[PDB]
Design a protein around this ligand. Structure first.
Ligand code: NA
Length: 129
């Protein structure tokens, strides 16, 4: 599924991401835009052989099991394939654990590089929430 901007903002809010660990909804929508372009099926291989999955490009190195990331963990207790569903529940649940890990949204390098400090409210401007 490719979400619309206000559609994803609505789904993230309903799943309780809005102000989760103090991060406004606009931060999560900005992160998703640059990680996945709002595509739940997005996959990207890392140099270390781990893979990133779904709207929020969650890494098999720590968070999900894909069966091909040697010496990795599965701290969200899910197959990485669950992070590609049209239903964003698994991605949101796993993102809540990641952002609680101690470095907040800095865990998402694209959030640090492209969203952090910017007018993130623009990402939910005109959305019926
Ligand atoms: Na893993």
């Amino acid at each position: 599924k490719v979400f619309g901007r206000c559609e994803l903002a609505a789904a993230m809010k309903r799943h309780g991401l809005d102000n989760y660990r103090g991060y406004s909804l606009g931060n999560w929508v900005c992160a998703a835009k640059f990680e996945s372009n709002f595509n739940t099926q997005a996959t990207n291989r890392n140099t270390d052989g781990s893979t990133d999955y779904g709207i929020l490009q969650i890494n098999s190195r720590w968070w999900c099991n894909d069966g091909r990331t040697p010496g990795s963990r599965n701290l969200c207790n899910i197959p990485c394939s669950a992070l590609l569903s049209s239903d964003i529940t698994a991605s949101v649940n796993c993102a809540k654990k990641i952002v609680s890990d101690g470095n907040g949204m800095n865990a998402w390098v694209a959030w640090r590089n492209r969203c952090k400090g910017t007018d993130v409210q623009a990402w939910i401007r005109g959305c019926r929430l």
